[PDB]
């Protein structure tokens, strides 16, 4: 039997396979900026 627990869970078996890769999606690399002085 071949287990799925590829990232962790309740228990993590020696995290992931040497060749499986996961990218994170930005959602934020747009930033249409202008010289606004938004003090905060």
């Amino acid at each position: 039997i071949m287990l799925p627990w590829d990232p962790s869970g309740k228990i993590g078996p020696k995290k992931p396979l040497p060749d499986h890769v996961s990218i994170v999606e930005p959602k934020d690399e747009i930033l249409p900026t202008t010289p606004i002085s938004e003090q905060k």
């Binding site: 995290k15 992931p16 396979l17 040497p18 060749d19 499986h20 890769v21 996961s22 990218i23 994170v24 999606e25 930005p26 690399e29």
Partner: protein
């Protein structure tokens, strides 16, 4: 005595550019770091080989699609 890159290396290099073309530039040791920061690879050496193909690839993107 030969050095060819595999599908895992190439495909991820493609995806990384197609997301984060602004983070990256023409320097290897910065391109090295950002890939570590965004992505979670299991191995230091796999980290290296991906970036080396990324940087080779940027110089092509400068001119010619």
């Amino acid at each position: 005595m030969g050095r060819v890159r595999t599908k895992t290396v190439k495909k991820a290099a493609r995806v990384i550019i197609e997301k984060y073309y602004t983070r990256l530039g023409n320097d290897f040791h910065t391109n090295k770091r950002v890939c570590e920061e965004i992505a979670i690879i299991p191995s230091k050496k796999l980290r290296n080989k991906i970036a080396g193909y990324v940087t080779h690839l940027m110089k092509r993107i400068q001119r010619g699609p």
